[PDB]
Amino acid sequence: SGFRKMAFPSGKVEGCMVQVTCGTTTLNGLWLDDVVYCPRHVICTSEDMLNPNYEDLLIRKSNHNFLVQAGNVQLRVIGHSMQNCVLKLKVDTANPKTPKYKFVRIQPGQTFSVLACYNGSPSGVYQCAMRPNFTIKGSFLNGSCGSVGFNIDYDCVSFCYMHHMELPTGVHAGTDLEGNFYGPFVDRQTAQAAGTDTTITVNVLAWLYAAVINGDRWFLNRFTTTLNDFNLVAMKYNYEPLTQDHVDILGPLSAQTGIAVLDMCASLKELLQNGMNGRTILGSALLEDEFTPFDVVRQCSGVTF
Prior knowledge:
Elements: H1 11-14, E1 17-22, E2 25-32, E3 35-39, H2 46-50, H3 54-60, E4 66-69, E5 74-75, E6 77-83, E7 86-91, E8 101-103, E9 111-118, E10 121-129, E11 148-153, E12 156-166, E13 172-175, H4 201-213, H5 227-236, H6 244-249, H7 251-257, H8 261-274, H9 293-302
Parallel strand pairs: 8-12
Antiparallel strand pairs: 1-2, 1-4, 2-3, 3-7, 4-5, 6-7, 9-10, 9-11, 11-12, 12-13
Helix pairs in contact: 4-7, 4-8, 4-9, 5-8
PDB class: hydrolase/hydrolase inhibitor
Keywords: protease inhibitor, covalent, virus, HYDROLASE-HYDROLASE INHIBITOR complex
Assembly: monomeric
């Protein structure tokens, strides 16, 4: 029993992290096969960052500009291209630690583990969620850019996030590993607004199912509701709409606990209106929306990798 914010083991990803230096700038790169992936803002000086033209900057650059260290060990760049906001540096050696991997683009609400890195070296690992406003509430300092978010599927590592930018509000913006930004953010030094951060309703319901499983039941109410009535109340508290797709994803947790999805909705409806009244759920005073239905099953069923 017990329920913690839990990351996947990071060993397989650690072996793919390298330092990328171009001129003065230094950040992190992902070495899979004979390709190194990093943010393209690596080629910018302080001047360029205000209003970069990446085509015009990348035109003047050649293979030999890019210093790549994998440990205390030089890697030879024998080619480079630009795919959106990501630089792909072809290297003369394939990574012998390359695990089974794929590149996926995640929806808002989906969680992933982040391996925070500086100068190509792992600092630590934490769980994140892609927010409805397409930001993430991560923990990143200068030179963190090129740190990746991942999910493990027994043997296979799914890379879904590369870190590119912090917004003045202190939340974070990045791309998938094809270099397309989550949300409408750009790799440029200008003030960018995130928008309304909403609560991932289906993730909250998942966390309440986790609570009941760990014998935390006080919030179970004596009322029920419909999906439409719940949504009308939810959206007034800036909670994301609950869909039929979301109800079906919660099926396994509904089966395990013997509490219909719509009953759990009704308990959450009451919590929104009445508040927690100083009470905690799984040792938390707020409602948590950064555990997926699959995160809860994984941690409660005991899935290994």
